[PDB]
Structure 1
Amino acid sequence: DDNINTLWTGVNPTTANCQIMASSESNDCKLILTLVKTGALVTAFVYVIGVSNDFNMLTTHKNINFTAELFFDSTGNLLTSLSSLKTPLNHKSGQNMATGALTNAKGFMPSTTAYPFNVNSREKENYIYGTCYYTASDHTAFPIDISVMLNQRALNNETSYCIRVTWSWNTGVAPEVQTSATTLVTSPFTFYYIREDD
């Protein structure tokens, strides 16, 4: 009440909390993720703020894709060692994460009834698509394709729920040139899914 209806990363973390590129090193961006319980659905709200030079310089290429993989255990806790996001989610505490135990965490998860694992005849049901935007140096909006796959494919036995968010573009010519590129920020993408029961 009402803070326990949100599970999130908090706002603008002081350091990179996410490793999106497998070639990184170490955390290479800030993943901002907010999940809000909305009746039978979750309202999910996600974007990235680039930190590493290699990540930011993706905007100099015409053909790119990168994926944040989020894996959760049987009670709705982020598995940080397996996931792109390396800091656990918690509830709302002002502009930050709370620090205690989670209330009803499993109820934030993508339902396995709506989004099954390993069922080929139903695999189309596991997908979400939309569009977000990169604000370019000339302040035009560069469209970025976003896809989300819910559950479908488990990494291993520990991972009871999965959210995989893939940003991509394939264009005639690129957001930015070497000297104009600054930070790869995506506009927030909001998507909805049927939630697992508490």
Structure 2
Amino acid sequence: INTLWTGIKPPPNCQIVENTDTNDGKLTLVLVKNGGLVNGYVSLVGVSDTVNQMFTQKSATIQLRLYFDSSGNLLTDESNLKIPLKNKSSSKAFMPSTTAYPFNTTTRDSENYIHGICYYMTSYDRSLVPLNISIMLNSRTISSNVAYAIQFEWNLNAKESPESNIATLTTSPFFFSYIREDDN
């Protein structure tokens, strides 16, 4: 049991727009155990029309947050990800360490975010547009059930909009790593 993921080329498996009832995103997430760390791979694909219109604006923002119970299982009800993760074959071993990225009540430790940049390929000329990716580990909690949390946030911000019509939103794969829990 080395890999915990959404699986390759998944079905619409998450909700990106506020107040919908139809999964409008294809989130590919791959978490791999490696020493005291976890290796991450995360890409996003737009399914709905409303989502695939987001990049007709000068700027947009997409935020998917995953919550987990004490076992390390997706709390599908609270999360924007609506389909549990599965092994490639507890998931606690894969969660973000609580001592490394605590759950705070006072502040939101800057120490809890991972920051980087992935890219969007335009429809017409394949040119690149930087998207700001940021991953918050644990930190905040919206339920008595929550024991672990991972939050992905993509951010568009450009002098002018990338697209003029609707087109399939796709974020370049962004790689990351964090200090993992370890049941115990």
Tell me if 1:86 matches 2:88.
Answer: no
Shift of 1:118: 1.1
**Number of matched pairs:** 182
The CA deviation string for residues 61-107 of structure 1, in whole angstroms up to 9 with x for no partner, is 112111111000001000111111111111115xxxxxxxxxx4101
Aligned to 1:139: 126
Q: Which has the higher helix share?
A: 1
After TM superposition, the score normalised by the length of structure 2 is: 0.94
Q: Which residue of 2 aligns with 1:169?
A: 156
**Distance (whole Å) between structure 1 residues aligned to residue 83 and residue 152 of structure 2:** 17
Structure 2 gap ranges (5+): none
1:60 corresponds to: 56
Q: Offset at 1:120? A: 4.0
- Of the candidates 169, 172, 178, which is equivalent to residue 187 of structure 1? 172
Paired residues of 1:116 and 1:122 also in contact (CA < 8 A):
no
Q: Distance in 1 between matches of 2:104 and 2:8?
A: 35
How high is the TM-score relative to the length of structure 1? 0.88
Q: Which runs of 4+ in 1 moved over 3 A?
A: 119-122
In structure 2, C-alpha distance between the alignment counterparts of 1:193 and 1:133, rounded to whole Å = 22
The answer on 1:48 being equivalent to 2:51 is no
Q: What is the letter of the counterpart of residue 174 of structure 2?
A: F
Q: CA deviation at 1:121?
A: 6.2
Check conservation: 2:47, 2:168, Cα contact below 8 A: yes
Q: Which amino acid aligns with 1:85?
A: L
Aligned to 1:124: 110
1:24-43 alignment runs, 5 A limit: 24-43=20-39
In the aligned structure 2, how far is the partner of 1:121 from the partner of 1:60?
A: 35
Q: State the SS of the aligned residue for 2:170.
A: coil
What is the one-letter code of the residue matched to 2:172? S
Residues 30-68 of structure 1, C-alpha deviations (whole Å, 9 max, x = no match): 111000001100011111111000001111111211111
Work out whether residues 108 and 139 of structure 2, in 8 Å CA contact, stay in contact via their aligned partners in 1.
no
Instruction: State the partner residue of 1:96.
Output: none
Q: Distance in 2 between matches of 1:121 and 1:70?
A: 20
Give the Cα–Cα distance (whole angstroms) in 2 for the partners of residues 129 and 6 of structure 1.
23
In the aligned structure 2, how far is the partner of 1:193 from the partner of 1:143?
23
Structure 1: runs of 5 or more not aligned: 94-103
The alignment-based identity, stated in percent, is: 52
CA RMSD of aligned residues (A): 1.3
Deviation string 1:135-164 (CA, Å, 9 cap, x unpaired) is: 112111111001111100011110100000
Q: Is the 8 A contact 1:65 1:168 kept in 2?
A: yes
Secondary structure (helix, strand or coil) at the match of 1:80 reads: coil
Q: Which residue of 2 aligns with 1:77?
A: 73
